[PDB]
Design an enzyme around this catalytic site. Sequence first.
Site, PDB file in Angstrom:
ATOM      1  N   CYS A  97      45.238  40.223  45.427  1.00 54.69           N
ATOM      2  CA  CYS A  97      44.899  41.534  44.867  1.00 54.69           C
ATOM      3  C   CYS A  97      44.516  42.515  45.968  1.00 54.69           C
ATOM      4  O   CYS A  97      44.923  43.682  45.933  1.00 54.69           O
ATOM      5  CB  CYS A  97      43.758  41.437  43.834  1.00 54.69           C
ATOM      6  SG  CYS A  97      42.189  40.679  44.376  1.00 54.69           S
TER       7      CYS A  97
ATOM      8  N   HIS B 118      33.823  43.935  46.699  1.00 52.44           N
ATOM      9  CA  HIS B 118      34.627  43.174  45.762  1.00 52.44           C
ATOM     10  C   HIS B 118      33.781  42.685  44.595  1.00 52.44           C
ATOM     11  O   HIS B 118      32.671  42.164  44.788  1.00 52.44           O
ATOM     12  CB  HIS B 118      35.307  42.015  46.511  1.00 52.44           C
ATOM     13  CG  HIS B 118      36.441  41.393  45.763  1.00 52.44           C
ATOM     14  ND1 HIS B 118      36.259  40.700  44.581  1.00 52.44           N
ATOM     15  CD2 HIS B 118      37.775  41.379  46.008  1.00 52.44           C
ATOM     16  CE1 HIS B 118      37.432  40.275  44.139  1.00 52.44           C
ATOM     17  NE2 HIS B 118      38.367  40.678  44.983  1.00 52.44           N
TER      18      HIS B 118
END
Length: 330
Positions: free
Chosen positions: A149, A176
């Site tokens: 990702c 994140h």
Amino acid sequence: TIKVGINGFGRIGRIVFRAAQKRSDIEIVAINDLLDADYMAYMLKYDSTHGRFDGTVEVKDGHLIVNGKKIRVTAERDPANLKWDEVGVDVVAEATGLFLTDETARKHITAGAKKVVMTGPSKDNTPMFVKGANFDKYAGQDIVSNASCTTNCLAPLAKVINDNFGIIEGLMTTVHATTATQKTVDGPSHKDWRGGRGASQNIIPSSTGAAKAVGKVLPELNGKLTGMAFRVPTPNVSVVDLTVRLEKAATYEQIKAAVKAAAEGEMKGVLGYTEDDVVSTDFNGEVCTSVFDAKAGIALNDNFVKLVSWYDNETGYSNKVLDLIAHISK
């Protein structure tokens, strides 16, 4: 239509399944994991992050009926025994995280599948593809990877910046969201001691290969980027913070204009662009894999700048997994 089997019904497997329902070129026909069909149905219908499934789910005879279509549910530990040909599966979305080499992933081909997409970075030389970076370099391989990702966020932005101004060197931080590998309270995590610390209590430094892996899908950037991560107590949506030194002098307004042009042109639907006062939840469900935040970034001077781009680390990546499946089936 392309018939897809999903191996692994974790976060990526379930969000790929949801995103696939709006598509007309792909239909999911089978799921494999160590979960009963009724548990599978429960996990599909209710989602803490993305809300209720928009559609119908029901169980009859050990198989799911989702939006009226029948889905085969199996629980094989050995991929070779999956009998993908019995349900006519063209491409397997390999989403367990355990079969990230050619040898392990190939047993899907042995089991009757024609091609495999790993939903994570390959651990060997299996080629990696990122939409907006190098889908056009695909050369008929039967096993591919959609990278990670974070690479799907960084690579399209890095390409625009490098193409227009020349990246001499860059360093990335990703802030994140918490993921499934983390722990609710301090617990065991050998191989990553910091990652065992309670996720909701902590900012947690973490290693990432995403910036180095940009050099795989954009070889012109091979040794020019690296990076690190901080895991923070949010359940979804992450942000890339990219500090780059540029060959060609570029004002911040020139940088914004170049990204906006790509977001409305060659990278439409991959790269987004906003000037609004956004925060992370504003991208929950975002399909673009990289949304440039124009007001959040800052330039020290015309050759040294910090750029900010959002990504839903579940939804964007999952939609581009489906895009790669459609691409290697063309």
